[PDB]
């Protein structure tokens, strides 16, 4: 097990490098949003006291934000709209496929839960055949217009992968992030980066659902379908970044460690 | 193309789906909201004072204040759900400068965390290796038929580490049902997320990342293992409506 050993360590060490990559990341979120965080606390407290001496007509207050936050977890006009529509019930399910599951609608039966789980185990696979399908086939519809821009810049074979890997990205980067936000934003009414941070966070499939978005519905979906496919490639590359940079700051390494003053 | 069919099976997938849950859910949904209509009226009538225009004004600043933790360890976890692409959303970014570090610090994280992921993957696939490898020859000089016995060994060991034990660790320490356990460890693991219910909403946290971690893997391959049995089960299907319309028709020809 002499490898198993050279996987091990080589194991460990990237797991320290994430840990350090999140405590930094954890640094600086606390940096971010705790001043935020707590600016908007003391202005609920304001708001709160605001409230009780100006209607003393009260530990119960209380007792309506807690079936106010108890209205929470199910989201004049007595008569509201529906989630669990005949569409909203679509969209829950692409979500759960796809495991992007923003949450802003969730099951509360018990039954519909234990149904989420079948049909996600489900689901998730089967919905890797399309995406991967989907992939290929959009890889290679690039790989044609590829081949034809190339031939026109053959004026080395080596330099003319940038240009192609920079072409990929700004066509793309337009085509299913500028664009589908645009679009996002003249309709949901989002400002210029929530937009943009929403339509990474969908593709991402990380979908906190602090932003979520007749003919409008199905193409957001059918958009997530093909842009997820779109970062899929995108999070591929970067990978290959961060190898090279990882094997390459290990030579970086290895040339001072020799040197080591000369 | 191949693809366009697998399309149309997630569509109808979908359909079906689509109508399950609000066939599930819009019953509650409804039950639940002509009794908050109750509630408010209750409230509105047994306070002549907090009339009706002095409510709704509220309710906006506390769905205003539903908008919205970030300590020491609640900003780490959060970075947790960032590169796992699980996103809880429980905790989320304000700040305009913390949203752009989150989409910065996401198509970085997301990446790198994968090849921890992979080499966790790889690391536990072959800490199996060797377990299975001792139960296969105590099978063997008692063979095709003896790797189904060793996947049921694997999904069963593994649902009872995974799955089992952590849930019931959950039930007892977030008391949750014995259902929301389990229902919050799939969405987890399958890195759906939605939120509704987070270990988070200091022996126990550092256990659920590191639990998060290794259990990723754990539905990677059970999630893999599915989707083999899905292209077995539709190329096991592909060839019995060859059988079908081959013998449909070898009597059409009768006449
Ligand atoms: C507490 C009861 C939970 C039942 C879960 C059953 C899951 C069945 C999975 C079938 C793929
Ligand atoms: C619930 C059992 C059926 C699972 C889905 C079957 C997929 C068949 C694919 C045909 C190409
Ligand atoms: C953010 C840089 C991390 C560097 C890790 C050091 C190990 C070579
Ligand atoms: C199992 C539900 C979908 C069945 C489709 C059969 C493939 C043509
Ligand atoms: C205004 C935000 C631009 C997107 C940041 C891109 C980081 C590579
Ligand atoms: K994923
Ligand atoms: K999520
Ligand atoms: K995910
Ligand atoms: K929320
Ligand atoms: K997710
Ligand atoms: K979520």
């Given at each position: 097990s002499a490898i198993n050993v050279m996987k091990w360590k080589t194991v460990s060490t990237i797991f320290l490098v994430v840990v350090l990559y999140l405590i930094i990341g954890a640094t600086v979120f606390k940096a971010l949003e705790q001043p935020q965080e707590i600016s908007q606390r003391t202005t609920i407290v304001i708001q709160r006291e605001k409230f009780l001496r100006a209607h003393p007509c009260d530990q119960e207050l209380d007792e309506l934000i807690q079936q106010i936050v108890?209205?929470?977890?199910?989201?004049?006009?007595?008569?509201?709209?529906?989630?669990?529509?005949?569409?909203?019930?679509?969209?829950?399910?692409?979500?759960?496929?796809?495991?992007?599951?923003?949450?802003?609608?969730?099951?509360?039966?018990?039954?519909?839960?234990?149904?989420?789980?079948?049909?996600?185990?489900?689901?998730?696979?089967?919905?890797?055949?399309?995406?991967?399908?989907?992939?290929?086939?959009?890889?290679?519809?690039?790989?044609?217009?590829?081949?034809?821009?190339?031939?026109?810049?053959?004026?080395?074979?080596?330099?003319?992968?940038?240009?192609?890997?920079?072409?990929?990205?700004?066509?793309?980067?337009?085509?299913?992030?500028?664009?589908?936000?645009?679009?996002?934003?003249?309709?949901?009414?989002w400002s210029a980066l929530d937009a943009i941070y929403f339509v990474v966070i969908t593709l991402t499939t990380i979908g906190f659902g602090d932003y979520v978005a007749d003919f409008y519905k199905p193409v957001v979906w059918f958009w997530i379908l093909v842009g997820l496919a779109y970062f899929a490639a995108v999070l591929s590359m970067i990978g290959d970044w961060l190898r090279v940079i990882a094997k390459k700051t290990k030579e970086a390494v290895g040339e001072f460690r020799a040197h080591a003053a000369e």
């Open positions: 108890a209205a929470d977890n199910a989201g004049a006009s007595s008569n509201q709209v529906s989630h669990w529509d005949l569409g909203s019930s679509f969209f829950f399910a692409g979500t759960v496929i796809t495991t992007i599951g923003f949450g802003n609608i969730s099951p509360r039966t018990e039954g519909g839960k234990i149904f989420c789980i079948i049909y996600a185990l489900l689901g998730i696979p089967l919905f890797g055949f399309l995406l991967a399908g989907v992939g290929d086939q959009l890889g290679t519809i690039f790989g044609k217009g590829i081949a034809k821009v190339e031939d026109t810049f053959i004026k080395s074979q080596t330099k003319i992968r940038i240009i192609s890997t920079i072409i990929f990205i700004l066509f793309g980067c337009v085509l299913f992030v500028a664009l589908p936000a645009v679009i996002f934003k003249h309709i949901e009414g």
